Amino acid sequence: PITKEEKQKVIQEFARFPGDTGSTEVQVALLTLRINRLSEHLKVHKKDHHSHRGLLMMVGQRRRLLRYLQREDPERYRALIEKLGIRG
Amino acid sequence: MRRYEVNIVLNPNLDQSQLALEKEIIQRALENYGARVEKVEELGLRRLAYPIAKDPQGYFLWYQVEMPEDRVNDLARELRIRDNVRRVMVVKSQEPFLANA
Amino acid sequence: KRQVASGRAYIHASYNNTIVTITDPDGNPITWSSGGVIGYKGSRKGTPYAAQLAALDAAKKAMAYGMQSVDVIVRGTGAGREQAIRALQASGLQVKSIVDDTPVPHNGCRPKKKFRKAS
């Protein structure tokens, strides 16, 4: 699954400042993580719909955060995207 | 790396030589799949609740290994292969939930 | 022609007819009997009485093969199960034991409408 390490290693990798857990970026970071994992889980299990909804929801919450970002500081935004790999 | 428990049951008629033969393989098998053996509990022969493979008895084993989740099945998919091996049940380590204590 | 003494008796009861079957310690039948066996066709077949008759019949016949001790095994229900046993117990044979070994699935084959309904 997703190691605490795997997780935290990402949190550190994004925090606005030391000890940043809930900043917008961090969140978007994590989601892209959980999304990508599950994005994979279904690459195989094309039947497992129930899980797929969970996915739809994640994609939601993400676009929503970002939209907010885009709006507030259009800079950080352009940053986070590139920095991640969203918008193919 | 997760801790499991490998219940194993083979033919109770085996002779010390034939019996060791199987064990030899089991140990190997485990090690063939990163089954780091934390401990053993070889109970021996026991009166089965119902016959198995026709035999009214069963010779048990119990290894509390630690190995790669991604290969637990492979491991047993491999253990069941042996013929004198009639039962295999790779449980997962669980904190002892007590009661009336 | 065999002389067994220590045997075994199987009572298969049903809401349609009772039918006992005496057997040797290995499980091989020796003598058998049904409500059918003794007259009684169709309806009368089941009834506890017919069951008594058959019960006895079974023993009486196995009384030749020299039977004496028997372990009774009941299967099913039906007017006549418990009854038959009463018979055997008397008859002449020593009824060392009784055990209900009626078959029951742990839910497998869909029963016919007759016995459906369960949700």
Binding site: - | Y50, M89, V91, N100, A101 | V99, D100
Partner: protein, 73 residues
């Protein structure tokens, strides 16, 4: 009417999770490989839930039965 005694009482500090402890588990089965109710075992929906799970394991392992023949009748 299950008015005898809770199996749990006539027992000790035992691990409901141990599926090889025949000697103690065998207690929760009736006069058949039938896992007793709570009106007889007397455990929390949670404890009882675990036992049941455990027992079934013993069955596969072959230490505990699935169903015994009913004597008497």
């Amino acid at each position: 009417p299950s008015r005898k005694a809770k199996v749990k009482a006539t027992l000790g500090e035992f691990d409901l999770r141990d599926y090889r402890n025949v000697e103690v588990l065998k207690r929760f089965l009736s006069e058949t490989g039938k896992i007793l109710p709570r009106r007889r075992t007397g455990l929390s929906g949670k404890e009882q839930r675990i036992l049941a799970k455990t027992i079934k394991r013993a069955r596969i392992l072959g230490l505990l039965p699935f169903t015994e023949k009913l004597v008497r009748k």
